[PDB]
Design a protein around this ligand. Structure first.
Ligand SMILES: *C(=O)[C@@H](C(C)C)[C@@H](O)C(=O)N[C@H](C(=O)N[C@H](C(=O)O)[C@@H](C)CC)C(C)C
Ligand SMILES: *C(=O)[C@@H](C(C)C)[C@@H](O)C(=O)N[C@H](C(=O)N[C@H](C(=O)O)[C@@H](C)CC)C(C)C
Ligand SMILES: *C(=O)[C@@H](C(C)C)[C@@H](O)C(=O)N[C@H](C(=O)N[C@H](C(=O)O)[C@@H](C)CC)C(C)C
Ligand SMILES: *C(=O)[C@@H](C(C)C)[C@@H](O)C(=O)N[C@H](C(=O)N[C@H](C(=O)O)[C@@H](C)CC)C(C)C
Ligand SMILES: *C(=O)[C@@H](C(C)C)[C@@H](O)C(=O)N[C@H](C(=O)N[C@H](C(=O)O)[C@@H](C)CC)C(C)C
Ligand SMILES: *C(=O)[C@@H](C(C)C)[C@@H](O)C(=O)N[C@H](C(=O)N[C@H](C(=O)O)[C@@H](C)CC)C(C)C
Ligand SMILES: *C(=O)[C@@H](C(C)C)[C@@H](O)C(=O)N[C@H](C(=O)N[C@H](C(=O)O)[C@@H](C)CC)C(C)C
Ligand SMILES: *C(=O)[C@@H](C(C)C)[C@@H](O)C(=O)N[C@H](C(=O)N[C@H](C(=O)O)[C@@H](C)CC)C(C)C
Ligand SMILES: *C(=O)[C@@H](C(C)C)[C@@H](O)C(=O)N[C@H](C(=O)N[C@H](C(=O)O)[C@@H](C)CC)C(C)C
Lengths: 192, 184, 187, 189, 188, 189, 190, 188, 188
């Protein structure tokens, strides 16, 4: 479809801004889609840009995502942890799979979800075809990746790896209040 | 899409400048992303001045509607909902979401409401989880509509079992809107 | 398009059915549940007709389903009659496995017939739990395939594993040295 | 239309190919796959079981097919006690030309306007470099086997076969006789 | 048993006509059809080597090599093969119509005959295409050589006439030397 | 599913169409192509071989089809000794209506509610200007042949047939009688 | 116009986020490597050298690889140009992407703590005559030898070891990639 | 990340057009008429801008249309300015032909770039006459291609023919000895 | 992807607009109604800008719609400025026809450019009356094409018909001798 342009007067002329770009000026990043390499490349670039303009002031990341590539999510995750500013994460709609992972990845004390926003967690998925040697390698890799995913989730939520392992066997849906109890968020955002 | 100059503005961008957001498309994650951005943008400009949201939608993703819904309730400015054409499913839900006393539907606009849809395919354990998640989502959906309209949860449940087509006057009677817009 | 013969009352056999009367089974296609179903039926019928006399199985197969291949293998070993295996064209994958399954001293390949051996293939899609189960099943099936080949060729499992890692093409003489067959048929 | 039926007198009916099989005549008029090879081999074995002395006539009008399927047929021809006469009608190309040369020596025939084609085998290689290397050696080794057998059965040198089959090589009935592919260009009897 | 008789797809109508030494061609000439026609010619010779065979042609042609397989079996077999043209004998069909026994090639009053040069295809390298072009030219040379012998026309004339599509009536086809006579309705 | 009938001689099965062939009835219920024409011609030639004296009944319910395939049927009808009776049921159109007129004179019928359609032949030409000219000349000459024969069999002039077949002309049973395509309209016995 | 329109992602008439990073000499590789992607990256490297030959260039790689020749076009340019190219791995560097990660200025090749590095042998397709397949097999075998030779020089690993480790897919952590010699330092957040 | 943008502090450039300003033309596609048109216009544009200064053409091309390559080739040879050809990644088929087309002394390939030479491919479908014409054209076009290749490398036409029968892959050092390039580009 | 040229306010031009500013028109595609419209509009624009100064038309076209080419042809002749036609790569069919249609003494082809001439193609489907009308049109249009080509080249209509019966491929020198072009462009 179409996204609106916001035009505003500057010191040296009139700037036409993309609506997301306009929000970007106020240090707001909107993730509203599945996470692939192109989406991860965008988000990382926005994060690196926001640090370059100001390394002290906070960055707000809105997360409404069904997730996508794990590696693409890890590209985003590592960038969040590496940059100097605190990245505030706000869940609206649904933050699932990798989206739930990135929501819990925000600055501790600054991870929020909106009252009717949903959070879901589950174990990762993969594919494997060809020879038995090739399938074993792919099988060992997805199990090794899952161990890393559970371990980081244990650090973020405060829940044990064994609990994370048990609670992600099948899809698990949570409320904003149930997500706060789990340790995925800090506070449910209250109307202002 | 036509362009107007003052600064060259497209027609939707020109109306955004006067705090008007047009939602004529189907509600997906992309559309929900854009509406939330516009709502947050208009609050930053002025937190007191109202915003007008025209609704002409057959709905779409339930969670995507909730992203818009929770943003409407969260922000300081009052959001007015204006129904033109048809507000069905999640679009009707977003119409009821407008600031109380400021929800209108136009005389010949149609309002349709019904229960949510889903897909569950795979093992019996996986189907049960998908079945329980949709059933809990509907309860939440019914519970919110109860509060917006004043109708009982059990009534909302019974009425949304099948497709329910309501006129502008019928929608007002239901409490989905406050007034019917008078030609002036 | 396949010819019919009439043996003199008078009753009509198709060309393959006629050879089954002389206890000859033609496997000349990919091995699936259907083909395995047909081959097993022919093995059981021929045993019921006569328990003592030898059965001749011609193999020209790229292979196919492993379990379907095992349905044939187990029937071959179970029945009382000796099943001679003759390789013409190509016995690859499960075909080479079924070729080596014949009665010892009675496994043949023709002079220009080819034999291919390699590790099995699989497909796993879904959750990490689902993939672990699938990988464990495929790997364990390979162990089963390797130890049976060890028993029938005399080669060690370490050699079978090493030599089946990639596609391995063998001539009739090379297969005999390996122990997949006993003799190379001569004109 | 179709393939006609013949009745011999109770009453019995043959399809036209099945009637010819009675007189030890086999028709190969399609691409050579595993099914076609399977059918052809069985007919050779059935005819030998019926009589191991008398000659078999195999008509060849084939564009070729699988090399392994052709070798299944080839190896059966050499194995059986009866001589197999090869008759080329229309076109014998690739593996079809190879099988025409496979016929009993002194008994390979082609009709006056029948065409014979010889060329190197085709293949496919996909995936890893190690996987490609293995497939390349197999097609190369199989080509050497095909060229070696062709040299033995025509009288041309291996190096000449290699050079002549590098590209598509078209031969007339006389040219096939000169090449040693057939013994005689069958002329009207 | 008695074999069930049927019209199409069992004892079909063609099998019943085959008893009286009549071979019906009402389709494209490909390897399947060539193979079947050839088998019928060989079967009919085995039954009787003296009695004449009747081949009705209503074909638009097909594979050149398929035509030659039918063509050469016609020339080799001892019995006379009479060619009757009904509807249309085009391309390899018209070539096969001229192949019939001399004095015994007929076409019906409104039967059409078409003669034209052979078609082909070549894809790939310049060496690959050169070989394909050389093969198609040599095959065309062979086609005109044989037609010349059958028609009585010169090779040079055949080349000119079959350059483009050449539609001939039954009377025109007789004039050309493709057929011996036109089967007029007034014959008992 | 085409039902079959069994009769005693010994016991012989017939499909319904070949059972009707025993009483010299040929059914044309399909669009005329080279396969259909090949079947019809065979039935006409088989019936002559059985009996030269007795009439043949050809029911026609066809939209038409290939002109050359229609001419193969037409020419065979005129060549054989038996009179061919043409009965129209449902719709005889295009090439089928032409074949309806081809019946033995005084023995061409249409049933009370059967329709007849006549029109000029269709065609296709795609290529060079030389190639289109030849195809265009061929189609126009073929139309002359169709109109000349229609003029002879019906009784109308060539100029009237040319003008009436310019567009699609739909005729009833009574109109087809008056035009000359049939002789009588069948009545319930 | 006095000023250019600003957009994040994106005919194109605007100032996208990647261009703003390109002003600070940063190149974002976040896709599979084809000739189109290679062309743009090479153009960015050549442009950045022209602006300032002394200052460093930062190449972020999140790639599964692609064309070997397209990867080599990027590779040769990195080595040819005067400015140092720092390579940073985020998410995944696999195949030709891991090769380009090794290609960065020695002492300036980084990976993020949960970034993955994957190395394996090249892939190909060959369909046709036995003569034609032989050429394709020889060409892919020579290209693997070239790839292994360059990786040996870059990582400090022996050619023999590279051949063995790349026979099948080989998944490495950021620490394991550092020990291999593919990177220099794991960019730890602390 | 697409084809990014460069801002001159406003003036906006896409990355390739910015390099065009500094006389650098990027060819990294299959060569077809649209591509050929873009290259030619760029070459004529740069000639019109200045007639003395060199033009740099980077080649990462698998090949393309032969006539479209010649459109580019002939424009290069006609214009006053020297055009330097730089091979990055792969210069195959016509890409290798255009690589040899550069100003002598100024034809470079990077150390790990690949050069590939082979005979052209064609298509011929239809009548035997049409096939003969099409075969003649592509054989004559191949004669033209080898002739120009011979003139620009110093190799005999007989050698070029033999070397382009099948796909021939050459290294950057190997291309230099052949005469396809002058020097292997060395790091600074 | 076409590069942008910026000339100094400051103006943004795509590469084809910048060459259009210097009276150069690029034709490097199939000739259809859209292309022809764009080509014709450019010619009218350049006459409006300057009636006296010469226009340059680069042609790399395989052909297209005959009527669309005539819109270009008739506009070329009607306008006051001399239109120079330069064959780059390949001018085939209507592209060749338009090449010869340039101002006399001002029509060129580059040393390795190709020119191909042949008769027109058509499609006729439907009723016999409809086929006749379509066939007459193709035949009238061919005669119109041959006559104009005869006038331009100076060759007889009889020779035109004979040379365009099949595909005819001409070298740059052979195009000059034929009279399709006046001179072959020599490198500077
Ligand atoms: C959540 O967003 C999951 C998707 C919605 C399915 C996501 O976490 C996920 O697991 N994605 C899978 C993935 O990226 N797998 C990769 C891979 O197979 O390459 C590795 C993590 C496997 C170890 C997608 C669906 C393949
Ligand atoms: C109205 O717009 C509804 C339909 C489009 C008519 C909409 O509310 C709806 O039910 N959407 C469904 C949906 O979001 N389903 C999700 C899902 O399974 O992903 C369920 C979780 C909702 C309970 C779409 C049609 C799937
Ligand atoms: C040889 O015939 C093998 C292939 C056809 C090349 C055959 O042995 C084989 O591996 N078949 C595979 C198979 O049956 N896989 C099953 C399966 O995943 O269902 C595995 C359990 C076997 C270990 C086919 C190709 C899937
Ligand atoms: C002639 O008949 C050849 C082709 C049909 C034209 C035939 O000899 C041939 O090369 N067949 C190919 C073939 O069997 N290739 C096998 C294979 O791919 O397994 C190679 C092992 C042969 C060396 C078919 C067309 C693949
Ligand atoms: C008439 O029957 C001709 C065609 C139906 C138009 C027939 O003679 C013909 O041209 N057949 C072509 C053919 O046999 N081509 C082969 C080939 O491509 O291999 C050439 C060898 C024939 C010289 C068919 C239409 C391809
Ligand atoms: C009635 O059946 C007519 C068609 C169904 C429309 C039939 O008479 C007819 O015109 N058939 C066309 C035909 O055979 N055309 C051939 C041809 O193009 O080869 C012309 C030679 C006829 C003059 C069919 C539909 C092509
Ligand atoms: C990693 O990026 C590899 C694949 C994309 C997974 C990459 O190294 C690779 O193998 N690329 C292959 C390639 O470039 N193959 C060419 C070719 O056959 O054209 C070979 C010449 C390389 C030696 C692609 C995937 C075909
Ligand atoms: C290398 O670029 C070659 C191929 C793309 C691999 C290229 O030189 C080539 O052969 N191109 C072919 C071509 O342009 N053929 C023309 C044509 O068909 O008009 C012939 C006249 C060339 C003799 C393309 C691939 C068709
Ligand atoms: C050259 O460019 C020719 C073709 C494009 C190869 C061109 O001259 C030509 O024949 N064009 C055909 C054309 O426009 N035909 C019209 C038509 O059928 O409408 C005829 C009236 C022309 C006499 C195209 C290919 C249809």
């Amino acid at each position: 479809n179409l996204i609106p342009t916001v035009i505003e007067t500057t010191n040296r002329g009139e700037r036409a801004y993309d609506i997301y770009s306009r929000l970007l000026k106020d240090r707001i990043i909107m993730l509203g889609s599945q996470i692939d390499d192109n989406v991860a490349n965008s988000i990382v670039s926005q994060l690196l840009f926001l640090q370059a303009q100001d390394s002290e002031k906070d960055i707000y990341l809105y997360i409404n995502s069904p997730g996508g590539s794990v590696t693409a999510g890890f590209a985003i995750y590592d960038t969040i942890q590496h940059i100097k500013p605190d990245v505030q994460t706000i869940c609206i709609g649904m933050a699932a799979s990798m989206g739930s992972f990135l929501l819990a990845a925000g600055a501790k004390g600054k991870r929020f979800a909106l009252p009717n926003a949903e959070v879901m967690i589950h174990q990762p998925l993969g594919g494997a075809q060809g020879q038995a040697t090739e399938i074993e390698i792919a099988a060992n890799h997805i199990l090794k990746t899952r161990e890393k995913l559970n371990r980081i989730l244990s650090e973020r939520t405060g829940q044990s790896i064994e609990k994370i392992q048990k609670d992600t066997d099948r899809d698990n849906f949570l409320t904003a209040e149930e997500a706060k109890e789990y340790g995925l968020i800090d506070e449910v955002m209250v109307p202002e």
